[PDB]
Amino acid sequence: MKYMITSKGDEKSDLLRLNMIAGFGEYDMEYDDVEPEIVISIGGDGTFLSAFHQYEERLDEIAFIGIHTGHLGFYADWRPAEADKLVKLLAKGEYQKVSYPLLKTTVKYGKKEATYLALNESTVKSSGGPFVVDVVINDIHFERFRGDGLCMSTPSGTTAYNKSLGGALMHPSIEAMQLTEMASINNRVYRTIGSPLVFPKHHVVSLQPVNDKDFQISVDHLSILHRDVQEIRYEVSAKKIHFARFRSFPFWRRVHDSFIE
Amino acid sequence: KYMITSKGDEKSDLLRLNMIAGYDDVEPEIVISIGGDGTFLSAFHQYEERLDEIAFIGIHTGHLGFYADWRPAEADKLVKLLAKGEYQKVSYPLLKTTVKKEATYLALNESTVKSSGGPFVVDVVINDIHFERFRGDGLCMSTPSGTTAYNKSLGGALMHPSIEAMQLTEMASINNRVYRTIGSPLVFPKHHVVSLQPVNDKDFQISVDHLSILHRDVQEIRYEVSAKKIHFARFRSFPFWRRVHDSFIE
Amino acid sequence: MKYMITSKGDEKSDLLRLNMIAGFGEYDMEYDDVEPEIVISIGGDGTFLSAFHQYEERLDEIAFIGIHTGHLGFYADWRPAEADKLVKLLAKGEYQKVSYPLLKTTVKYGIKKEATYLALNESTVKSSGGPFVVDVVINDIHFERFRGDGLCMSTPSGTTAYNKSLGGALMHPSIEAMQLTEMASINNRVYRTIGSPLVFPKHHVVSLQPVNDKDFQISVDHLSILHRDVQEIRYEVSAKKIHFARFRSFPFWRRVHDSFIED
Amino acid sequence: MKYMITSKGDEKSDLLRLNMIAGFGEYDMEYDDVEPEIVISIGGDGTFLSAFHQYEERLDEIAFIGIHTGHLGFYADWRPAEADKLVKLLAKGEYQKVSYPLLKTTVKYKEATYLALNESTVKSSGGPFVVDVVINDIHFERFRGDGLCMSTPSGTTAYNKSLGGALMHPSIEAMQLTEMASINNRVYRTIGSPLVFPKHHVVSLQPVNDKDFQISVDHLSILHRDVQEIRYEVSAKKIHFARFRSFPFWRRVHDSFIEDLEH
């Protein structure tokens, strides 16, 4: 079937890429980056994130595969030494499909509205000065946050930025999103919950401005300034990312190999 | 068929009599606790063996609770609604705790394991696979509704009770070279089993909600999301996040 | 004696400043914004920081005073209504001086030459763009390889500021120290970090050395500027201290209490 | 001169103890268990703590030495392979002294006084733990949780670290208060951040309802009936260590929490 391979850009990934593509020269596999049915990323989780957003329009017809030329990643969990075995197993078709939840981020202005999908997380920070927003949960005011910013994470994203912010780790089979605080000043004037908050499906977390209406909104690796922001809504997306499962690599093992060892 | 449990004070017992006027203590379909969350926990453990046939209602004679959701003065209209049978049931996940014949426990809030005198050292096994060797005060495994309790004080995350899961938090982990721990709270879905296996000392203080019993000769402690759920009789709409807001945000 | 007054800029602070200047004119006082012996800040902590750095070359000959026109600040102790008595007590010279420690920040490059900075609150180091990875070297000895958003080194009086939000401990400003806090460390097996905040005494030097990227966004009391081709960033408790004119007794722990607990 | 050796109690520590005693017999070393000038601890930090409390009445004339028979300890930083060198180094008399601060714990109900090398904690003797935290004779907060931990500087790497407290170099004469599983709701508002107090600062813990508190000192956990006040302050007493080679505190922190590549 149709496939394509993205590379980190360094000699390790570029050479491994060409070596794998040559491997598909012995099987009924056509190279196509317009409408691929299988996308292989080579490099790191960051590289994998670029590959996700490169085809966030064809998520339902694409099985992603991650290969790390450096250290182990939670998305790039295949070693380059197993690149040969992957090609053969992929060319045959003996693989299952695993799906992870995604984060929907909607931004309203005072035009229209913009929506974004995140595989890891979405963060909102200030355009320079102090970051002050109201946190509205299901059309109900919850807290007035003051600090550096807020981070809404996917379940698979919990092991990334979320973890460094003291967030909890969630098994990606759990369809949910997690909100963590970034350097919250927690005084009497600005009282926040402190604890990370985990939200289920169909729950909407709305971030509404108080004074300044310009915000730095990041989606995974990408980050851009949004001016005249009226509202920033978070909810678990109805869209999912599909992985190609060849072997059995448990989420918790992957957590163990990263942080415990 | 219904029944009413009281805290023990004069106000709760009086309200119990004042509500009983508007009864099966063996085969109940409606259990009404009068007191607080702690009192509610007692009513839960009194009927663990028929949770699929019982809806619970909490009345807080003191401060607002996460289980006791009704005000004392609102007991007048509560009877007329619980008699018509016009109510929908809300289900919360529970935590199963097996100790190893073997003893199994059900918790509405959380279950914790600490050493009965001395250092607490345990191997954390996740799905038959070693994850970390823990050394410290202990570990806490919390239900979603229990996250607002001890879990929160231990730095755990708050999660909505509609999410079927359990959350593991640390209790003063030393987290060094010998005993490297994850630090982060861990949230496990259904059918995931966390196993605690001793290294030397096999005597542990195991607590289930309000009950803290001492266990000797422990070989394994298994944690997983129970197949049973607790049902609440719902009349009005009280959002979980509102209860969280009212409790901590003020 | 010689003095000057800085203002937040709003109508309130500007008005109070003019009235204090006229008040001072009734005594043996002279306005001098070049070589003052007393510097008065009217506004908030942020206003106080600007005044601090405006005269950081004369910290040895200046006694600072802070007046908060809004909410109570850790540096701005005095209320606007007390400005009257404050003028009189200043003119008589009826006050003692209290000193807080400062943080020295040295930036070395590859050879332009060298740059040093004094901090009243804290000094942070983050990346210019991309992963922030540095080697933390304590007194010439390697301690950890840090990956994350950045690192924050706080003065004692700075511990109630950014340091606190980052989980740092609150430290009484009579203690001559500096506290290093992590900013979202990844803390995995490759980049294992201590996690805990570190409190260093005087003469202890913390060296942040680049692993790959030599460009860093360095901030000193929210004065964040881009430093390129950085070879080393050294942290140590300065020998210079900021001096406060003391009249009444406003305990540090009460300032903390009134600001975070209840007032 | 006069020396003594305490052992962990196991086969390895008992043997090493006898081995050193035999070695000292070759030099001018007198073994005395009631009036030693140098106390050697063989085992772990726990064994070191017992040795401290065993001779806490004569801290003025005793220099302590720790040997860890297991993993590296913060007090027991000598390894068994270096035992031969220690005996010779002790007999030679060539060593300087290093002093660490201690925590004074006063319990008022007649007045009970305790000294802590690591820390002192106050938990509940059953039921909710609710106390009023008073700093220098003024209310600071009302705490509710599992308990509170007051740590020495050298104690910060112990229980204090696990509770999220900051690591502090023992050259700093201070004490650090950390919260143990606090409840932060609409009723009980605490500072959250660990607090570092200098000398001459008193932290008083006063009961709200329950007067029975489980007080621990380094690990002598004792139930105290009818408590009116628990006072915390930096002691004037200090523990003295015998120094021969350079083994930095931060190195000990590094080798214990980060990594130890040569072991």
Ligand SMILES: Nc1ncnc2c1nc(SCC(=O)NCCc1ccccc1)n2[C@@H]1O[C@H](CO)[C@@H](O)[C@H]1O
């Ligand atoms: N999250 C913080 N919580 C407490 N205090 C902070 C924080 N952040 C900062 S400055 C770093 C920064 O850019 N933070 C993001 C925007 C922000 C957010 C809140 C307050 C000021 C600025 N300071 C203090 O602000 C002083 C600047 O006037 C600095 O010295 C920091 O101590």
Ligand SMILES: Nc1ncnc2c1nc(SCC(=O)NCCc1ccccc1)n2[C@@H]1O[C@H](CO)[C@@H](O)[C@H]1O
């Ligand atoms: N401290 C973090 N610990 C774990 N993971 C993080 C972190 N920070 C980030 S992105 C936030 C950021 O720009 N931080 C400035 C320094 C930095 C550090 C790492 C990667 C990129 C940039 N991600 C993950 O990086 C992914 C982009 O490749 C994002 O999706 C975050 O999950």
Ligand SMILES: Nc1ncnc2c1nc(SCC(=O)NCCc1ccccc1)n2[C@@H]1O[C@H](CO)[C@@H](O)[C@H]1O
């Ligand atoms: N979690 C702790 N992490 C580091 N260190 C601790 C801790 N806990 C303690 S004592 C508190 C206690 O009894 N905890 C029960 C479980 C436990 C677990 C490990 C070690 C001792 C005890 N200390 C240190 O134990 C020393 C006694 O040998 C005390 O001085 C504490 O510093």
Ligand SMILES: Nc1ncnc2c1nc(SCC(=O)NCCc1ccccc1)n2[C@@H]1O[C@H](CO)[C@@H](O)[C@H]1O
């Ligand atoms: N630090 C904690 N913050 C929040 N909640 C806690 C904590 N600790 C506990 S149990 C351990 C302990 O020492 N608790 C004293 C507080 C308490 C609270 C309610 C009822 C009895 C006692 N729980 C909850 O107490 C419930 C018993 O009613 C248990 O289910 C814990 O979740």
